[PDB]
Design a protein around this ligand. Structure first.
Ligand SMILES: CN(C)c1ccc(O)c2c1C[C@H]1C[C@H]3[C@H](N(C)C)C(O)=C(C(N)=O)C(=O)[C@@]3(O)C(O)=C1C2=O
Ligand SMILES: CN(C)c1ccc(O)c2c1C[C@H]1C[C@H]3[C@H](N(C)C)C(O)=C(C(N)=O)C(=O)[C@@]3(O)C(O)=C1C2=O
Ligand SMILES: [Mg+2]
Ligand SMILES: [Mg+2]
Lengths: 197, 197
């Protein structure tokens, strides 16, 4: 044990994959680290705090499109931002659940301010620009949550009208990705509309 | 004890409110009913099955706009359908989590077939019509999940750029409802677009 925040979060990320969000505990975490449970406090207070750092960490590694490139349309940006957010959530077991209920923190202030200012100078009012953000985040979270639940819920469970069958089979056969890429693009047309004003 | 499925689900709905989704168990349920745990099996196999019935029940009571009224635009219908779905999820503690990962069941076949056929005769292809449905459901679920988590997550936790502050305060001050009504309406403009074809 070199004893590191970075090693704790690494190890916690692994443990999340092993047991998932409900089964994750600080007790189980220290044991995986081969340390006593008081020691691990020097890095995490408790489960919520641990979960906040896991959520933060998943963005650090995977949410790469947190920032607009100039010349890149706001439209492409809401697109690539949602994509990498999605990508962040999917990176681990219960990724979307680990994010749920988190809020902006100090180290995101600059990223997030830039995010609203980028939209604003495109001509969205601050209000619509923050609603453009929540619509995309709510929608993306909704997709990954359903998509992520699908598997554990299919484990624990065991004939119809032909259009419904066709619809389910089309839905089932096409991944989460198209269902995701589709709504994403409906939201972007709503916003292309709104902005025209 | 008259011993009823209807009484079990009533009582389970109550228990969900008391302890929430993770703390709900069949063990805790029978004890609330004043019965032994074998007895309660004659109505529910296990937690997943219980959760499926709770999810079903919340739609029965509250998801009233499951069906289009002719003369009612598809647009008004996707609107009122999302609204009452939302309404279903919010009706109980962890309502949105209880739905997560559920799938269409036999008694929904007629409702749901009608739902895709209604859109189809409006001129959506089956595929887009099922994507119009998932976009709205994913988005609605994403809203209520975040909205529902907000409170428990605020219990268990403890300064910034002024536009971010303004954005948070605007966001915070305006309920979940506007953030919800907004994305909903972006999705509907995307679909008003797509259909034009
Ligand atoms: C293909 N078909 C669209 C599927 C496929 C997988 C699914 O997991 C689901 C659907 C239909 C949708 C219908 C949506 C609908 N609406 C968009 C809210 C809806 O009215 C209902 C309902 N029972 O009225 C659903 O079951 C629903 O909430 C739902 O849970 C679905 C759902 O779980
Ligand atoms: C007002 N502002 C938009 C708020 C308010 C409450 C919130 O709970 C949140 C935001 C910003 C959004 C930004 C979205 C952004 N995007 C739409 C995916 C985003 O890029 C980030 C990010 N850190 O890059 C978020 O924090 C974000 O995922 C997020 O978690 C937010 C979030 O949790
Ligand atoms: Mg967030
Ligand atoms: Mg569903």
């Amino acid at each position: 044990s070199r004893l590191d925040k970075s090693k704790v979060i690494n190890s916690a990320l692994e443990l999340l994959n092993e047991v998932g969000i409900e089964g994750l505990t600080t007790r189980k975490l220290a044991q995986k680290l081969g340390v006593e449970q008081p020691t691990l406090y020097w890095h995490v207070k408790n489960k919520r705090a641990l979960l906040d750092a896991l959520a933060i960490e998943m963005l650090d590694r995977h949410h790469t499109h947190f920032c607009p490139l100039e010349g890149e349309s706001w439209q492409d940006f809401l697109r690539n931002n949602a994509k990498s957010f999605r990508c962040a959530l999917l990176s681990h077991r219960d990724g979307a659940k680990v994010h749920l209920g988190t809020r902006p923190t100090e180290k995101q202030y600059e990223t997030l301010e830039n995010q609203l200012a980028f939209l604003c100078q495109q001509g969205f009012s601050l209000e619509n620009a923050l609603y453009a953000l929540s619509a995309v985040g709510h929608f993306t979270l909704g997709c990954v949550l359903e998509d992520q639940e699908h598997q554990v819920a299919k484990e624990e469970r065991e004939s119809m009208p032909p259009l419904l069958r066709q619809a389910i089979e089309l839905f089932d056969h096409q991944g989460a990705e198209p269902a995701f890429l589709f709504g994403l693009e409906l939201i972007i047309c709503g916003l292309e509309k709104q902005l025209k004003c």
